[PDB]
Amino acid sequence: MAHHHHHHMGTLEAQTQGPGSMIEQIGDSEFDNKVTSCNDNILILVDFWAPWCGPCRSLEPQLEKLAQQYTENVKIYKINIEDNQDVATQYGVSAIPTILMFKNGKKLSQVIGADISKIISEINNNIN
Numbered sequence: 001m002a003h004h005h006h007h008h009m010g011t012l013e014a015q016t017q018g019p020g021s022m023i024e025q026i027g028d029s030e031f032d033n034k035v036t037s038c039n040d041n042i043l044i045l046v047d048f049w050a051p052w053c054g055p056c057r058s059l060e061p062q063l064e065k066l067a068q069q070y071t072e073n074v075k076i077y078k079i080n081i082e083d084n085q086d087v088a089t090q091y092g093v094s095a096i097p098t099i100l101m102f103k104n105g106k107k108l109s110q111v112i113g114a115d116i117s118k119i120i121s122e123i124n125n126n127i128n
Contacts, residue, residue: 013065015058022067023047023060024077034077036105043108043126045076045119048088048098055114056097062116063099066123073127101126 026034031046038044047063049056067076081087091100094112099119101108108126111118 011065011069013061015061017061017064020064020068022064022071022076024075025080026077027080031077031079034075035102038075038102038104040104041073041127042103043070043074043123044102045074045123046100046102047076047078048091048093048100049078050088050093050096050098051082052096054096059097059114059116063119066116066120070123070127074123 024034035044035046045063045067063076067074079087087093088098092098092110092112095114097114098110098112100110101122103126109122111122
């Protein structure tokens with residue numbers, strides 16, 4: 001019939017995804033705007049999805065995990081500038097993927113690579 005029964009929602013996954021992407025797509029001109037668009041203590045994670053895409057398969061839904069859990073104090077963006085590789089060299093992208101943090105327009109830490117443990121660690125570490 002229908003397997004509809006659940007209490008709350010915690011860290012439950014299956015490498016699935018579903019409709020409800022939180023990774024905000026932004027263009028070059030929207031970058032500073034969206035970084036400043038934060039209210040207060042809003043941790044902004046800027047993903048640099050390089051077209052190589054290695055462990056990105058797991059990390060993408062894992063980021064959405066943390067995005068949906070922490071969305072009350074977190075907002076993730078993904079920059080659309082696939083033509084300009086300089087952006088990588090400028091922002092210091094050296095892995096696939098690479099996550100920069102910003103908060104209230106103020107400079108925040110950067111986690112390069114695909115380590116969801118380090119990502120979540122810094123998320124809670126930078127919210128609190």
